[PDB]
Design a protein around this ligand. Structure first.
Ligand SMILES: CN1C(=O)CC[C@H](C(=O)N2CCC(O)(Cn3cnc4ccccc4c3=O)CC2)[C@H]1c1ccccc1
Length: 326
């Protein structure tokens, strides 16, 4: 295919799979390329290290290396990747970029793409007291045990939990109260990152199905008729084994349904079934990326070589020059 892969270089684990996921989030990729890293240190700037890994995956006829990126955000102990989990690596990457874009023509791009909003609420049954606290979110964590498919997870996720018995709610002035607490989606981000809670640690390999096409209007408190909350499957992040483990990701970068498996240094076309149903559950998904139907075409906009400023290309090329002292 057109696509190049990332070298295996450590217990980097899910890093390689997550790098491809962010790379084919094209609208991100092009914003990342607009960051002004011109004056930045070549060895300890994460923004500059995302630019290079992105640049390389757009230009490299050979597998791309990530040693410099690893070294930039400094996860360099023996259990650095073992100890953390996927959302965490992405928050380190996205928060670096988000901050680096502030005061550029591409400010707010990370929140625009990834940020949804949520209300968490507790209501006393017996007495008149109610707490409501809005929340932003960049990623949602879905429960998997006792759930057969994503819809049950989402249903479980908006479930009303009962605060009764010894587990009653402390309602301040009103004493210990019988109460209902739960969560509601006020909005859903153009790009929807979901984590399946398979680690409880131990790895549950149970059966859990997710759709090619994911309609989530019934989870919104207010359904927009003009922009219905329908999602398209984009990446399927895969682990096989335990403690043991291999990582790969499945992508259809264009949103079109022509899938490839991204297995580090090698990239290969595959069936939808390999990417979707074959990861339902030792080879199973732990993270899903979905793009909203209305926003598919902006997010997966075309990326030309000219979309990279030549100041950057010169810097990077220069770097490549020295390094090439073989
Ligand atoms: C087997 N195994 C190890 O030996 C070491 C860590 C390893 C791992 O790569 N992880 C990244 C992906 C995950 O982050 C998914 N996830 C995300 N958020 C969660 C929030 C709350 C509750 C659970 C979760 C959760 O499981 C897990 C940790 C883990 C693993 C476990 C399940 C699948 C694949 C690999």
């Amino acid at each position: 295919t057109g696509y190049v892969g990332l070298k295996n270089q450590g217990a980097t684990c899910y890093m390689n799979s997550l790098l491809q996921t962010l790379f084919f989030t094209n609208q991100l990729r092009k914003a990342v390329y607009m960051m002004p890293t011109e004056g930045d240190d070549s060895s300890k700037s994460v923004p500059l290290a995302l630019q290079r890994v992105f640049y390389e995956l757009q230009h490299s006829d050979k597998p791309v290396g990530t040693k410099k990126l690893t070294k930039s955000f400094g996860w360099e102990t023996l259990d650095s990747f073992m100890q953390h989990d996927v959302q965490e690596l992405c928050r380190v990457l996205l928060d670096n970029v988000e901050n680096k874009m502030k005061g550029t023509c591409v400010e707010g791009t990370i929140p625009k793409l990834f940020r949804g909003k949520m209300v968490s609420y507790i209501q006393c049954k017996e007495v008149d007291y109610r707490s409501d606290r809005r929340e932003d979110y960049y990623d949602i964590q879905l429960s998997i045990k006792g759930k057969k498919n994503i819809f049950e997870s989402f249903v479980d996720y908006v479930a009303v939990e009962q605060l009764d018995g010894d587990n009653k709610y402390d309602a301040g002035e009103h004493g210990l109260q019988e109460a209902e607490k739960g969560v509601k989606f006020l909005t859903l981000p153009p790009v929807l990152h979901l984590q399946l809670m398979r680690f409880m640690n131990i790895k549950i390999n149970d059966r859990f199905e997710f759709p090619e096409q994911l309609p989530l209007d019934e989870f919104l408190q207010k359904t927009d008729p003009k922009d219905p909350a329908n999602y398209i499957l984009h990446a399927v992040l895969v682990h096989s084994g335990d403690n043991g483990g291999h990582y790969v990701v499945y992508l259809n970068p264009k949103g079109d349904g022509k899938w490839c498996k991204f297995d580090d240094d090698v990239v290969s076309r595959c069936t939808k079934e390999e990417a979707i149903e074959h990861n339902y559950g030792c080879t199973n998904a732990y993270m899903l990326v979905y793009i909203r139907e209305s926003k598919l075409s902006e997010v997966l906009q075309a990326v030309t070589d000219h979309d990279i400023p030549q100041q950057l290309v010169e810097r990077l090329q220069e770097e490549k020059r020295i390094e090439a002292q073989k």
